[PDB]
């Protein structure tokens, strides 16, 4: 309820963050210097021993300890708004869980990376008679995933096309909840995220040549459906047509790796404007996205120190 009581702990968490020089010093190490620098970091409290999977589990536990509490301790419309921040991990968990349910593998075979719901609910949802019953088992009061499963559940029982329409309706329900919320910053942030995801899907569907109207979604502000068709076709001039929008440097780039890098850079630049509202909820989402970018960069530095990647090999990964 109180958008400032959580923001106080958010500012206290934002005071405890690694500097850019901590990543600049990580460009020259031997993973033992990186282990010692991680032992001095705030994430090092979950650091058990030495090794790449131990460091990965420590980074995951540190992210769950530093970001997972913000999904808790919230109430009402503030809780419903903050629920639409850590939604991608639970969506991927539910997607691979539905894929395993359609596959028939063991319930302990899945990894089940941390989301926003109870893990015992995900364990009980491994065996269910109907997918609507599994959604009712996984039903929270304000989670949009349960309502999206109830909406898209009137197609079949369990299909891969049902999972694709579930992901599309999950993005559409995120956009609808952003339209239905009183927050001038998070709505535009989610709209830019949806538009960048649509552009990434247009890049990832290049060469398929199928009907993009089924592939495209709704909710974006910088892209058009004719622009989506021109991006589905081999027309990088439409990518040059994105003038004035957040896709400023994103122009004429045919490389999908560079396209996703520029998309992540534009997303981090848009989330860096989240410090403008010090009384709302956008600063907490900005701190969450900054911790996520720092954790992805820490995992990249850990992989580079493990397998001996050059600093030139990671120079395209520390631009922002």
């Amino acid at each position: 309820d109180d958008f400032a009581y959580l923001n106080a702990r958010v500012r206290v968490r934002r005071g405890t963050l690694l500097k850019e020089s901590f990543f600049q010093e990580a460009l020259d190490l031997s993973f033992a210097d990186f282990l010692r620098l991680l032992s001095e970091t705030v994430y090092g409290g979950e650091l058990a021993g030495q090794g790449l999977p131990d460091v990965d589990r420590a980074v995951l536990r540190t992210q769950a300890k530093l970001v997972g509490d913000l999904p808790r301790l919230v109430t009402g419309e503030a809780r419903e708004a903050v629920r639409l921040l850590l939604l991608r991990n639970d969506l991927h968990n539910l997607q691979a869980l539905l894929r395993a349910k359609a596959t028939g593998r063991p319930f302990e075979e899945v990894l089940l990376l941390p989301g926003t719901l109870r893990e015992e609910v995900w364990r009980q949802a491994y065996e269910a008679q109907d997918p609507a019953g599994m959604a009712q088992v996984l039903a929270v009061p304000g989670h949009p995933l349960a309502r999206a499963l109830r909406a898209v559940l009137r197609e079949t029982q369990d299909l891969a096309r049902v999972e694709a329409l579930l992901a599309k309706r999950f993005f559409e329900d995120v956009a609808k909840a952003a339209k239905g919320l009183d927050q001038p910053a998070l709505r535009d942030y989610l709209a830019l995220e949806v538009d960048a995801e649509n552009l990434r899907t247009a890049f990832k569907l290049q060469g398929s040549g199928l009907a993009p109207d089924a592939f495209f979604l709704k909710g974006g502000r910088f892209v058009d459906r004719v622009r989506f068709a021109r991006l589905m076709e081999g027309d990088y001039a439409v990518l040059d047509e994105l003038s004035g929008t957040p896709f400023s440097g994103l122009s004429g780039v045919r490389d999908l790796k560079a396209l996703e890098r520029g998309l992540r850079c534009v997303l981090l630049k848009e989330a860096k404007k989240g410090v403008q509202d010090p009384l709302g909820v956008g600063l907490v989402l900005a701190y969450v996205k900054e911790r996520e970018w720092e954790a992805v960069r820490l995992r990249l530095l850990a992989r580079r120190a493990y397998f001996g990647l050059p600093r030139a090999q990671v120079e395209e990964e520390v631009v922002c």
Binding site: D2, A4, Y5, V12
Partner: protein, 73 residues
Amino acid sequence: GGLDRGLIAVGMGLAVGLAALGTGVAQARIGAAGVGAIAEDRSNFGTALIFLLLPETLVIFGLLIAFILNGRL
């Protein structure tokens, strides 16, 4: 005739009540932020108490004006 002391006391009471309302309106957000800071860490309790005590001057000036009106009463 006898409509002076009651009106003066009514104005002083309106002053004290609206000053207490404004002081509580400030103290709501002040104490909410201070309690969130204390729940974040137990290291800035005095700095939060400083922000909690910074807003009492409005109610203090209201009580001073009420005492001045009572001296006029």
